[PDB]
Amino acid sequence: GGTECKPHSRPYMAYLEIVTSNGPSKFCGGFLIRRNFVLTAAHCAGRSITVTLGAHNITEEEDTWQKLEVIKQFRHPKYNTSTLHHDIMLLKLKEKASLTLAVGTLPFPSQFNFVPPGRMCRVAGWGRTGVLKPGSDTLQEVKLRLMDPQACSHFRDFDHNLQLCVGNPRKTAFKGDSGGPLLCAGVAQGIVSYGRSDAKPPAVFTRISHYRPWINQILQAN
Ligand SMILES: *[C@@H]1O[C@H](CO)[C@@H](O[C@@H]2O[C@H](CO)[C@@H](O)[C@H](O)[C@H]2NC(C)=O)[C@H](O)[C@H]1NC(C)=O
Ligand SMILES: *[C@@H]1O[C@H](CO)[C@@H](O)[C@H](O)[C@H]1NC(C)=O
Structure with a gap:
């Protein structure tokens, strides 16, 4: 990881x-x-x-x-x-x-669907996100799980319709760069948005759909 x-x-x-x-x-x-x-x-x-x-x-x-x-x-x-x-x-x-x-x-496929909690996705990047110093200067990738939206209930305005809840706290700091894509099965389904200052998962990603x-x-x- x-x-x-x-x-x-x-x-x-x-x-x-x-x-x-x-x-x-x-x-x-x-x-x-x-x-x-x-x-x-x-x-x-x-x-x-x-x-x-x-x-x-x-x-x-x-x-x-x-x-x-x-x-x-x-x-x-x-x-x-x-x-x-x-x-x-x-x-x-x-x-x-x-x-x-x-x-x-990486063009989007014509047809898409709302992506539910459960699947594993991957994010690659250079770590340019948040306030924490990267990290590394070469492109790296991590696998992260899409979580039930309740796992992000501590983020005040979190909205399942708009955002993905990403990364299992009990199984996983790296989540790529701000603006980087979250790929599920080869399709970009989210964008790195934000997380806790301390970068403990889960993090919030824009729901691309x-x-x-x-x-x-x-x-x-x-
Ligand atoms: C990314 O590239 C930079 C620049 O080449 C690397 O930083 C150098 O590592 C070399 C190893 O040959 C050292 O001799 C230099 O002292 C380092 N210079 C700098 C700019 O820090 C860096 O290691 C590369 N990162 C990798 C390969 O992961
Ligand atoms: C969103 O930002 C607006 C600025 O347009 C601000 O007035 C508002 O408090 C924010 N949304 C809420 C109500 O949390």
């Missing part, structure tokens, strides 16, 4: 460098769903963003990298900084990524 990925085995993964209004840079994860669109968390928003596709060791620049500018951040309009509901955001890139072995998309209409609304107009 904390495993290094073979380099480039998750070629849709995106590493985000976010310029904040005040100057400094912060970082999140995300995933390439179209050649010019990256999906991530609303809490990753800032003045402007740049994505790095094709990475494995994020502190070691290599030739598989493709750095692309984000021209526009589409933060979900009902995003709430207190409840953290609707913590999702699309990033339109200046140009389409070039498809390579190391860089590919709920936002598929909005995702398509953005893609359709852009």
